[PDB]
Design an enzyme around this catalytic site. Sequence first.
Site, PDB file in Angstrom:
ATOM      1  N   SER A  42     -11.876  -3.295   0.119  1.00 52.12           N
ATOM      2  CA  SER A  42     -10.950  -3.117   1.239  1.00 52.12           C
ATOM      3  C   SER A  42     -11.780  -2.737   2.462  1.00 52.12           C
ATOM      4  CB  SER A  42      -9.896  -2.066   0.908  1.00 52.12           C
ATOM      5  OG  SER A  42     -10.512  -0.844   0.516  1.00 52.12           O
ATOM      6  N   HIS A 155      -8.419  -2.435  -5.697  1.00 56.47           N
ATOM      7  CA  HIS A 155      -9.354  -2.066  -6.756  1.00 56.47           C
ATOM      8  C   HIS A 155      -8.818  -2.377  -8.147  1.00 56.47           C
ATOM      9  CE1 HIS A 155     -11.279   1.124  -3.852  1.00 56.47           C
ATOM     10  NE2 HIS A 155     -11.373  -0.118  -3.409  1.00 56.47           N
ATOM     11  N   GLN A 163      -4.257   2.795  -2.909  1.00 58.09           N
ATOM     12  CA  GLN A 163      -5.519   2.365  -3.499  1.00 58.09           C
ATOM     13  C   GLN A 163      -6.098   3.413  -4.448  1.00 58.09           C
ATOM     14  OE1 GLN A 163      -8.675   0.069  -1.096  1.00 58.09           O
ATOM     15  NE2 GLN A 163      -9.567   2.128  -1.247  1.00 58.09           N
ATOM     16  N   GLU A 164      -6.009   4.696  -4.084  1.00 61.03           N
ATOM     17  CA  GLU A 164      -6.700   5.764  -4.802  1.00 61.03           C
ATOM     18  C   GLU A 164      -5.796   6.980  -4.957  1.00 61.03           C
ATOM     19  OE1 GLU A 164     -10.451   6.472  -2.841  1.00 61.03           O
ATOM     20  OE2 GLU A 164     -10.828   4.315  -2.624  1.00 61.03           O
ATOM     21  N   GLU A 205     -13.107   1.625  -9.645  1.00 54.91           N
ATOM     22  CA  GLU A 205     -13.756   2.915  -9.452  1.00 54.91           C
ATOM     23  C   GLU A 205     -13.624   3.839 -10.659  1.00 54.91           C
ATOM     24  OE1 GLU A 205     -12.782   4.603  -5.669  1.00 54.91           O
ATOM     25  OE2 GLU A 205     -13.867   2.983  -4.605  1.00 54.91           O
ATOM     26  N   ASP A 242      -5.949   7.944  -1.006  1.00 51.07           N
ATOM     27  CA  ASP A 242      -6.438   6.900  -0.104  1.00 51.07           C
ATOM     28  C   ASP A 242      -5.411   5.778  -0.170  1.00 51.07           C
ATOM     29  OD1 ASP A 242      -7.597   5.005   1.482  1.00 51.07           O
ATOM     30  OD2 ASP A 242      -9.438   4.752   0.327  1.00 51.07           O
ATOM     31  N   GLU A 281      -5.997   9.755   3.175  1.00 54.57           N
ATOM     32  CA  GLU A 281      -6.937   8.853   3.827  1.00 54.57           C
ATOM     33  C   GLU A 281      -6.240   7.543   4.189  1.00 54.57           C
ATOM     34  OE1 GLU A 281     -10.532   8.007   1.581  1.00 54.57           O
ATOM     35  OE2 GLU A 281     -10.710   6.038   2.553  1.00 54.57           O
ATOM     36  N   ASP A 308     -10.861   6.248   7.534  1.00 52.99           N
ATOM     37  CA  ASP A 308     -11.899   5.438   6.898  1.00 52.99           C
ATOM     38  C   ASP A 308     -12.040   4.133   7.678  1.00 52.99           C
ATOM     39  OD1 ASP A 308     -13.588   3.937   5.263  1.00 52.99           O
ATOM     40  OD2 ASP A 308     -12.103   3.703   3.656  1.00 52.99           O
ATOM     41  N   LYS A 333     -19.345   6.157   5.232  1.00 56.49           N
ATOM     42  CA  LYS A 333     -19.874   5.086   4.385  1.00 56.49           C
ATOM     43  C   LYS A 333     -21.051   4.454   5.103  1.00 56.49           C
ATOM     44  CE  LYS A 333     -15.672   3.719   1.905  1.00 56.49           C
ATOM     45  NZ  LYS A 333     -14.387   2.969   2.065  1.00 56.49           N
ATOM     46  N   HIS A 361     -18.716   6.648  -1.580  1.00 56.98           N
ATOM     47  CA  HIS A 361     -19.142   5.407  -2.209  1.00 56.98           C
ATOM     48  C   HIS A 361     -18.362   4.225  -1.628  1.00 56.98           C
ATOM     49  CE1 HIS A 361     -15.703   5.777  -5.426  1.00 56.98           C
ATOM     50  NE2 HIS A 361     -15.291   6.041  -4.196  1.00 56.98           N
ATOM     51  N   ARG A 362     -18.713   3.019  -2.081  1.00 58.42           N
ATOM     52  CA  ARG A 362     -17.850   1.853  -1.953  1.00 58.42           C
ATOM     53  C   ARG A 362     -17.298   1.509  -3.327  1.00 58.42           C
ATOM     54  NH1 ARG A 362     -17.866  -0.318   3.203  1.00 58.42           N
ATOM     55  NH2 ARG A 362     -15.725  -0.728   2.495  1.00 58.42           N
ATOM     56  N   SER A 363     -16.269   0.662  -3.347  1.00 57.25           N
ATOM     57  CA  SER A 363     -15.705   0.279  -4.639  1.00 57.25           C
ATOM     58  C   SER A 363     -16.675  -0.590  -5.440  1.00 57.25           C
ATOM     59  CB  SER A 363     -14.359  -0.422  -4.445  1.00 57.25           C
ATOM     60  OG  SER A 363     -14.463  -1.528  -3.564  1.00 57.25           O
ATOM     61  N   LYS A 384     -16.613  11.731  -1.964  1.00 58.82           N
ATOM     62  CA  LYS A 384     -15.708  10.853  -2.696  1.00 58.82           C
ATOM     63  C   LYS A 384     -16.576   9.817  -3.393  1.00 58.82           C
ATOM     64  CE  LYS A 384     -13.091   7.515  -0.948  1.00 58.82           C
ATOM     65  NZ  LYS A 384     -11.945   6.697  -0.408  1.00 58.82           N
TER      66      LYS A 384
HETATM   67 MG   LIG Z   1     -11.616   0.330   1.935  1.00 58.11          MG
HETATM   68 MG   LIG Z   2     -10.922   4.039   1.825  1.00 57.65          MG
END
Ligand SMILES: [Mg+2]
Ligand SMILES: [Mg+2]
Lengths: 422, 422
Positions: A42, A155, A163-164, A205, A242, A281, A308, A333, A361-363, A384
Amino acid sequence: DVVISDIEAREILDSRGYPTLCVKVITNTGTFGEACVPSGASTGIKEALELRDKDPKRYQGKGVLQAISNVEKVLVPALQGFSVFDQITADAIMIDADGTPNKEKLGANAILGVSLALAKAAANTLQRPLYRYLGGSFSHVLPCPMMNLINGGMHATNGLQFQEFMIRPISAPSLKEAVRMGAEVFNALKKILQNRQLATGVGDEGGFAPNLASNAEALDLLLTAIETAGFTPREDISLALDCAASSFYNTQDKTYDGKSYADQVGILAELCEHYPIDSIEDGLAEEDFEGWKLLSETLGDRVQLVGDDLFVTNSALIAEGIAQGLANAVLIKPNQIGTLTETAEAIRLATIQGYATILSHRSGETEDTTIADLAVAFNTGQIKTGSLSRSERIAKYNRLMAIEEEMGPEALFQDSNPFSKA
Amino acid sequence: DVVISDIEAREILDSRGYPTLCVKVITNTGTFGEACVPSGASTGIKEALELRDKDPKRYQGKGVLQAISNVEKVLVPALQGFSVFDQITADAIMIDADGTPNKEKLGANAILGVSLALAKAAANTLQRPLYRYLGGSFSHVLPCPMMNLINGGMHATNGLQFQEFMIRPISAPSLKEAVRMGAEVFNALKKILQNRQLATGVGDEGGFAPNLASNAEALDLLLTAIETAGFTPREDISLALDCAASSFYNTQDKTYDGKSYADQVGILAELCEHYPIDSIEDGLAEEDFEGWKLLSETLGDRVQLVGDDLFVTNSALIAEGIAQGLANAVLIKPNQIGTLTETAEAIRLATIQGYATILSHRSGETEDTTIADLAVAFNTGQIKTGSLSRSERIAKYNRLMAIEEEMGPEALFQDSNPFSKA
Ligand SMILES: [Mg+2]
Ligand SMILES: [Mg+2]
Ligand SMILES: [Cl-]
Ligand SMILES: [Mg+2]
Ligand SMILES: [Mg+2]
Ligand SMILES: [Mg+2]
């Protein structure tokens, strides 16, 4: 004087099975440092350009041979002979060599690979910890992690909107104990899911990706797992989101799966009323000013609001958003901007304005653990870096635990979320 | 004269979120090596003992503080002052210090952590690649991988009977090309599952864990993914199984989910007739002599038959099974026996009898990549180290690609399965 002698780059795979690069900077004394580049799913529209080969017969167009070529053929002659210790100079050289605002010519993945590997080469030359080289003698704060135990959005393929879904072990006395708390909640959650005949396969993740009826059901499951593991919600462990709202924002109709930004803020405000959420987020989309303004006026004095995709680790956008009163925390990031120098300046500019920063991190991750050192180097107090499965996540927790043990009495585990439930 | 000066051990998490150890051997000159210890789920009853703390208030009894204490308090005094290069001597000292056949006193995980880290410390002292230190100047064969893209058995909660459904990219001209082929098939399979409304969450080894109606359905999906990626089944990519049949063997009546050993051999023979399977691991349970004998007589001249729980990387069991005519290949898992010395001897005894050996991960892995160096060190020609997601798997593929590139024209990619479909 120790100077850059050569740079090697090679194509590896990330944790999703997609190509990325590993870069090795070698000095005239034979010391070296090596770093790998992550990749988001994303991705914010304003992120610096991840350069892919677009060969349809090879990794479905996702090779990074061109970025590797740019390291070897362009960045090597541009950097040879410069001091391994002149990080800002080398990052400026690479930025100038590409010559485009978003690093589209050489690739932000080529440039970041060198930027990270260079800093490691310098720390390795000094035989000093990377976090001390980058952050100085008073880097000592271990970050409170937010741990993504249920995965959705881009993800997973479970149809989960957000997403999270994260927990934050805010009562932990140490990072080592925060890791244990998260791991015990994670494996209690696996058993809860199995007993409910819900899937326990994990998303990108490392959080479980069951089919759920709503975002709320995921939060309900986190609360049940927290209590089942013997901890007290809000008191021991709080919740974080997130939304990655750009992923479900219709730019033409200005709707979040049919909801106006006012409706979406009301949805978020209701979730905070009923669940011990202390951080949200990307609750609105990356360029929804009116939505972010209303979110910040509504919840900005009671909950951490993390930008983000709003900020894409970009100093100029961070300054603009701070001036407009948007959000109160910045996700960091490095590959969203492409150099460590610009990553450090994003942290500095946000921090001096009272915003918290959260290394992320990134996914699509690798066995690289640099963001663990970065979080400690800048004393950010938050990180994170994933669920408690898959070693591209676990390796960062292991590295944080090693840093904490190495520092001995110097270490301080401390959450920087000022809206924490503790 | 470089000798062992100290050994550190620390508790980390593995790829499932469970504790394990990482061990660091330090020499009197300051050189060092570090290694982490994996952990199985479908563990053979004859495996050397993985020592866990059994404290129910900590990681559900899975801590490894006692194993760490054994490294620090017992193995350090026993090994201090011995040469870093005398690997066989050090492994013998540790075996004698524990004093039990199955390493139950100190723990096979304590002992293996030291054994692996010691070899790395020696290689690092010489500044030589680990595979060359362990295997000598003619270590040069890169292994053909078998890649577990759909996970079942004890590695998932999807109810799929067999544990691992693998592809083997046998037409690859190099290891890096084998990695690409596997990654392309894996990501084609992800889209196929999503279009069939099947789950794409991954099991412990990074393969998808959908709910399927049968083992055959998983094989059908592998074939569809191979074809969708534009590869030819049998010619480019063959199939392999790990049934892990001990996992569904009823010791009370000696049946396989109700089937006799003769029925089960018949089931496997029919799968081999209908699918391009060229390798079957643990098709019968670990102590089922009549079953293994019939399997070997029925299929042993047409398909690779891999003993895993049958042999548990144990030289004495390997010798006995070979003398009885059972199987024709051995899976090599260092933590099933606990020292590198015994791992090497298991490989040697099998190899001189014409059995292939296959270096293998465990389902609980870490960021450690030692088995990649071991597969090359012993020129085994085959490796089993997971799907194309999760970096505790990907890191081994990345390490193999680095080894291959490092060797340049010395490298030879070569499958050692003599029953391969190509
Ligand atoms: Mg993203
Ligand atoms: Mg994000
Ligand atoms: Cl499913
Ligand atoms: Mg097993
Ligand atoms: Mg067992
Ligand atoms: Mg097995």
